[PDB]
Design a protein around this motif. Structure first.
Motif, PDB file in Angstrom:
ATOM      1  N   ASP A 161       0.785  -1.222   0.000  1.00  0.00           N
ATOM      2  CA  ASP A 161       0.000   0.000   0.000  1.00  0.00           C
ATOM      3  C   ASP A 161       0.828   1.289   0.000  1.00  0.00           C
ATOM      4  O   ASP A 161       0.513   2.270   0.688  1.00  0.00           O
ATOM      5  N   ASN A 185      -5.654  -4.482  -5.634  1.00  0.00           N
ATOM      6  CA  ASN A 185      -6.858  -3.976  -6.288  1.00  0.00           C
ATOM      7  C   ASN A 185      -6.592  -2.715  -7.107  1.00  0.00           C
ATOM      8  O   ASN A 185      -7.128  -2.570  -8.212  1.00  0.00           O
ATOM      9  N   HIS A 186      -5.733  -1.829  -6.611  1.00  0.00           N
ATOM     10  CA  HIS A 186      -5.448  -0.557  -7.337  1.00  0.00           C
ATOM     11  C   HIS A 186      -4.599  -0.727  -8.603  1.00  0.00           C
ATOM     12  O   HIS A 186      -4.573   0.158  -9.444  1.00  0.00           O
ATOM     13  N   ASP A 190      -0.980  -2.467  -4.414  1.00  0.00           N
ATOM     14  CA  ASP A 190      -1.397  -1.069  -4.253  1.00  0.00           C
ATOM     15  C   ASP A 190      -0.204  -0.079  -4.317  1.00  0.00           C
ATOM     16  O   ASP A 190      -0.140   0.882  -3.551  1.00  0.00           O
ATOM     17  N   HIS A 213      -3.508  -4.290   1.829  1.00  0.00           N
ATOM     18  CA  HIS A 213      -4.921  -3.906   1.617  1.00  0.00           C
ATOM     19  C   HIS A 213      -5.601  -3.255   2.837  1.00  0.00           C
ATOM     20  O   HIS A 213      -6.269  -2.236   2.682  1.00  0.00           O
ATOM     21  N   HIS A 255      -2.697  -9.428  -1.367  1.00  0.00           N
ATOM     22  CA  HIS A 255      -3.417  -8.189  -1.157  1.00  0.00           C
ATOM     23  C   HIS A 255      -4.905  -8.418  -0.891  1.00  0.00           C
ATOM     24  O   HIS A 255      -5.756  -8.313  -1.799  1.00  0.00           O
TER      25      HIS A 255
HETATM   26 ZN   LIG Z   1      -6.009  -2.523  -1.563  1.00  0.00          ZN
END
Ligand SMILES: [Zn+2]
Ligand SMILES: CN(c1nc(Cl)nc2c1nnn2[C@@H]1O[C@H](COP(=O)(O)CP(=O)(O)O)[C@@H](O)[C@H]1O)[C@H]1C=Cc2ccccc21
Ligand SMILES: CN(c1nc(Cl)nc2c1nnn2[C@@H]1O[C@H](COP(=O)(O)CP(=O)(O)O)[C@@H](O)[C@H]1O)[C@H]1C=Cc2ccccc21
Ligand SMILES: *[C@@H]1O[C@H](CO)[C@@H](O)[C@H](O)[C@H]1NC(C)=O
Ligand SMILES: *[C@@H]1O[C@H](CO)[C@@H](O)[C@H](O)[C@H]1NC(C)=O
Ligand SMILES: [Ca+2]
Ligand SMILES: [Ca+2]
Ligand SMILES: [Zn+2]
Ligand SMILES: [Zn+2]
Ligand SMILES: [Zn+2]
Lengths: 527, 526
Positions: B12, B93-94, B61, B219, B196
């Motif tokens: 992150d 996810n990003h 991320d 995450h 993540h």
């Molecule tokens: Zn995330």
């Protein structure tokens, strides 16, 4: 025999020469507008033509209220009161707002009717200069009878206006009594007390001043009515209000609200010795059913042209009713109070040069300093003219350093005699206050949270009594006005700031569209 | 036999390429700044020179967070992760924010390290196109041993990003177990799960996936520490967090907060069969004691020049700290939420020609959509760059017509699982809400007052279940996001508004000086 007298009366017109909205603000929707001298003339003439014995009297506060007074400075009052043929006027506190000169030159020298006040005594070089320009009384012929009119003015005029150091405002009852006595000795048997001290002084005068038959008042904007009242104003008593005097008589006491919305109308029935046998009437609502007189109207339009320079420039827009009503801003949180305080705060933060006041987030504002609403319908335009009626006193928004305790005292003073529509009630910013009115005066503030300054993120934390807070407020408050003596005596620093009306116009111009809310800054609890 | 491995890890980072303030916002006072890839390089190299067996891992991320990603679109990630010589990365996810092509063309084709996820399955035309650009695992040589690294990615990625319909996000444990078992048969006795999905999923993986020796996570932005922590972050547990697994072993689970503020550091002591005997470590705070590496720093400054167009024009000034912190805006009223809602409301009233929304006074805003604070020290300047980190999602502020009942249900959803730092917590304007958290989920809103529209003077009246309200909100929320399905399903009208970052800069340029306060819009009672 019996002898009938019709008293027509106005008080606290407050520069409303033109017709107004229902709420005293500028007329926009002509179909539903009210008052103004043109309409008033129509009705006065309707009564004069139908009844032989009529006096039309004013109880003061014709001066100050709109750009009419800002531009013409009392000349409009002399002129349009002459056109209406007033028989007499009592001086009010606002008749001193441009000093004694501003009373003498525009109004006292131009008026074609006696102007009265028996409790104002002149001293020093002024005594001879003003001698006779106002009188303690006048005896007026009315048909074959004579009627004595004796004047009085609030003894709070030195604290509300600029009467100067050469006028002494004597206790009203003490000053009036020898004059009413004088008149009785001159076999004047009908006596009207006409004056500007409030409904409560008026009842005292009626009670205590022997010889007075009727009291015609002003200053407290009191609405009196008998029966189902015709507009939004809630009756404070019957019309007339009957005082039982200290000498066994029934003295009727009358007032007619404010802003030229009503013409008071009292029919008195006198006996041959001048005792009041009876009286009856009500204020006449000057609504659009009554036409504006064409001649007066046309003359108002001529005078109007010079005022149109204050209404050319749209400053901005309001999408909400800006509630500057006495009945809101002296009794509870009002969105005009909020707008003004936020404007104050906002404008002060522009002056980055002066680093002591550059995070000031707290504001207090006397409710009685807010003088009119502004209407949001018809695109809710806001001009200088609209602002000038909200803020006619030409003040400044000053900066003070106050102890928590001083501020706590101010908030108690704010509600110490709550319920009488007095101006010391405080509108605010950066302050959440809670009042419990069931508690004793001086102990009604149960919660007082203010925005912190020492903190990185502002939040409302309880006010601490030994802490010091920086506050933006009118200089009127800074100098101890509305009996906020603690502010004056206890403040730690006082700086002049910007002119009140420029501050708010500057805010409106910047914002373009305004929409102040009643947010919960002032609350009332029961626990 | 004992074999020591040092796992260095980040997760992150969220496009914090440059060093940052303590709170993750733009660096201004360089003496107190932290993080950044240049500083991280210095510390990684210090450990590589002391420790022979070292893996540097990222748990996803890297994408999205600052004008670095707006401008360079992931190229900065590949470049500076390559310069730091990362050994592997798990997809977050990003990494799908600019779609699959935004993953493929910048990051997957330029990365000189394996990029991993075992529960992302490609189907249709994409499968052959993306084949081998990410892997379910990698077997990395580390001295005379090998270490298998198996990846995983949050199955909320479809609700949080733009992965498209050709990628299928399988359950983590169901996907990971066959891969870990496959590696065992391939004589890979040391296995790291790098992924993540959150600290909670990380712990489950530790517990349930037989053969995993360490879980390295992301995450949830989780801070673990053993001792007196070095900064404002409150540990959620020990570092490493020890999970006692169903098959009788101790499995250390590690995360390292976010924003490149810390380098995670865990020394594992393995036996000859790849069973963990001992582990110890802590996240290392990358404060200004550690110097920025001159070369990485000079290279950052070369890339920086294209970004200075976004910080040249001051938009205005804050005289207050603008608290856009996760820890404020997901748990209580925060003055950045208030700023943004007031900007939403204000900017909308400009649009005078559209009569249906020209009195709109009610705003709701997901806390999780506010992504950084802004500092007031040193004249509290606000630039596009500062704003770009508060609102990096590129959304619009839309206008919906909602039943009171729908909105009441929204505010219940807002606190339904309160305490877990989730983004659905609602910042507001023109709404005074009061929550009682001792009450049952779905029944925690005990007061909900909203500004009236029909009235001539606005005031806060209690919300009525069957009345209808006009509300300005992010398009993310209008379109059902953050679990707010009732909004998508029950809204009566929905109109596109203006771009979010535009709205807030326009408001700041108009105000010049801003000073948003916490006012009592959101309160908690007992
Ligand atoms: Zn995330
Ligand atoms: C600037 N001045 C003032 N500045 C503001 Cl900022 N506010 C005021 C002021 N004076 N009074 N007030 C407020 O008005 C209230 C009474 O209204 P009413 O009860 O309606 C009876 P009125 O109709 O005679 O004024 C009070 O309590 C206050 O809240 C006054 C004080 C000296 C002076 C000299 C020359 C000109 C005007 C002034
Ligand atoms: C515009 N989109 C979004 N728009 C806003 Cl306005 N807010 C969001 C969004 N997506 N998520 N969130 C908020 O972020 C919270 C999680 O943060 P964290 O718990 O910190 C774990 P992360 O670090 O992976 O995001 C959530 O609850 C939300 O409150 C997403 C939705 C589709 C999409 C496609 C391409 C690009 C971005 C998006
Ligand atoms: C004026 O007032 C009278 C009663 O006081 C009422 O009958 C009449 O309709 C009013 N005129 C209006 C609203 O124009
Ligand atoms: C960096 O961190 C350590 C504690 O982890 C501390 O001793 C050192 O002084 C810090 N340096 C700073 C704040 O500049
Ligand atoms: Ca008599
Ligand atoms: Ca093993
Ligand atoms: Zn008055
Ligand atoms: Zn008065
Ligand atoms: Zn993240």
């Amino acid at each position: 025999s019996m002898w009938e007298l019709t008293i027509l009366h106005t008080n606290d017109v407050h520069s409303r020469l033109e017709q107004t909205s229902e709420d005293s603000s500028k007329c926009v929707d002509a179909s539903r507008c009210m008052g103004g001298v043109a309409r008033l003339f129509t009705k006065v003439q309707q009564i004069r033509r139908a009844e032989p014995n009529v006096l039309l009297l004013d109880a003061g506060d014709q001066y100050q209220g709109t750009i009419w007074f800002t531009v013409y400075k009392g000349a409009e009052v002399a002129h349009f009161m002459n056109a209406l043929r007033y028989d007499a006027m009592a001086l009010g506190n606002h008749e001193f707002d441009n000093g004694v000169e501003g009373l003498i030159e525009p109004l006292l020298k131009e008026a074609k009717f006696p102007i009265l006040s028996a409790n104002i005594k002149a001293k020093g070089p002024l005594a001879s200069q003003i001698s006779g320009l106002y009188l303690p009384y006048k005896v007026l012929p009315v048909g074959d009878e004579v009627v004595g009119i004796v004047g009085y003015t609030s003894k709070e005029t030195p604290f509300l206006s600029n009467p100067g150091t050469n006028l002494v405002f004597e206790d009203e009852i003490t000053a009036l009594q020898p004059e009413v006595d004088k008149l009785k000795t001159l076999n004047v048997n009908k006596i009207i007390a006409l004056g500007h001290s409030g409904f409560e002084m008026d009842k005292l005068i009626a009670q205590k001043v022997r010889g007075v038959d009727v009291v015609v008042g002003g200053h407290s904007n009191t609405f009196l009515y008998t029966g189902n009242p015709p507009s939004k104003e809630v009756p404070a008593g019957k019309y007339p209000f009957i005082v039982t005097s200290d000498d066994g008589r029934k003295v009727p006491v009358v007032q007619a609200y404010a802003f030229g919305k009503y013409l008071g109308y009292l029919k008195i029935e006198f006996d041959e010795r001048g005792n009041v046998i009876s009286s009856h009437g009500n204020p006449i609502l000057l609504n659009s059913s009554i036409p504006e007189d064409p001649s007066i109207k046309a003359d108002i339009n001529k005078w109007r042209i010079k005022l149109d320079d204050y209404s050319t420039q749209e400053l901005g827009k309001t999408i909400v009713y800006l509630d500057g009503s006495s009945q809101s801003c002296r009794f509870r949180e009002c969105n005009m109070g909020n707008l003004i305080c936020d404007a104050m705060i906002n404008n002060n933060l522009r002056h980055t040069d002066e680093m002591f006041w550059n995070h000031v987030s707290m504001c207090i504002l006397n409710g009685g300093g807010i003088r009119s609403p502004i209407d949001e319908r018809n695109d809710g335009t806001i001009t200088w003219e609209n602002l000038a009626a909200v803020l006619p006193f030409g003040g400044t928004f000053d900066l003070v350093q106050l102890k928590g305790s001083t501020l706590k005292k101010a908030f108690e003073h704010s509600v110490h005699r709550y319920g009488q529509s007095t101006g010391e009630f405080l509108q605010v910013g950066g302050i959440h206050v809670v009042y419990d009115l069931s508690r004793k005066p001086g102990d009604r503030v149960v919660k007082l949270d203010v925005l912190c300054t020492k903190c990185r993120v502002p939040s409302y934390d309880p006010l601490k009594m030994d802490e010091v807070y920086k506050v933006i407020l009118p200089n009127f408050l800074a100098n101890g006005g509305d009996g906020f003596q603690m502010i004056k005596d206890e403040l730690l620093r006082h700086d002049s700031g910007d002119q009140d009306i420029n501050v708010v116009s500057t805010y409106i111009s910047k914002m373009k569209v305004i929409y102040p809310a009643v947010e919960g800054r002032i609350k009332f609890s029961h626990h």
